[PDB]
From Swiss-Prot:
Cysteine disulfide partners in this protein: 6-54, 17-39, 23-48, 27-50
Domain of life assignment: Eukaryota
Keywords (A to Z) from UniProt: Antimicrobial, Disulfide bond, Fungicide, Plant defense, Secreted
Function (record text): Possesses antifungal activity insensitive to inorganic cations. Causes germ tubes and hyphae to swell and form multiple hyphal buds. Binds to the plasma membrane of the fungus. Has no inhibitory effect on insect gut alpha-amylase.
Gene Ontology cellular component terms for the protein in this record: extracellular region
Family: Belongs to the DEFL family.
Alphabetical list of Gene3D superfamilies matching this protein: Knottin, scorpion toxin-like
Record-given protein name: Defensin-like protein 1
Any GO BP annotation: defense response to fungus
Listed SUPFAM superfamilies: Scorpion toxin-like
SMART domains: Knot1
Organism (species): Heuchera sanguinea (Coralbells)
Localization of this protein: Secreted
Length: 54
């Protein structure tokens, strides 16, 4: 229904997140974030945030 996922900042990804598909792939590939990730705006640019389950 609505699993609670927390968008956590990546230390691996830096710069800009233009593709959420690659962001999510990165999160699943790098760590145990099977829910992937999304491009979330933070200062100063859109960065990749991995979705962990909370």
């Amino acid at each position: 229904d609505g699993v609670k996922l927390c968008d956590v900042p990546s230390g691996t990804w830096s710069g800009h997140c233009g593709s959420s598909s690659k962001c999510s792939q990165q999160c699943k590939d790098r760590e145990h974030f099977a829910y992937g990730g999304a491009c979330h705006y933070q200062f100063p640019s859109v960065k990749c945030f991995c979705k962990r389950q909370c």
